[PDB]
Amino acid sequence: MPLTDPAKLQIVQQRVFLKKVCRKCGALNPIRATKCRRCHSTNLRLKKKELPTKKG
Numbered sequence: 001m002p003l004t005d006p007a008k009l010q011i012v013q014q015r016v017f018l019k020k021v022c023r024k025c026g027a028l029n030p031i032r033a034t035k036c037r038r039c040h041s042t043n044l045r046l047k048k049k050e051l052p053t054k055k056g
């Protein structure tokens with residue numbers, strides 16, 4: 001991301017798991033966060049992990 005840190009304790013350092021975006025605000029929280037840092041409503045959805053080519 002535009003904020004290019006060296007390596008936080010997040011998925012920035014080569015992870016296939018994306019971040020979670022609040023379905024209320026659209027606030028994307030770290031995979032470490034338990035809930036939204038906007039409304040604290042625990043209403044987050046992790047972005048489409050997607051697939052490589054086939055299922056598995």
Ligand SMILES: [Zn+2]
Binds near residue numbers: 036039
């Ligand atoms: Zn929210």
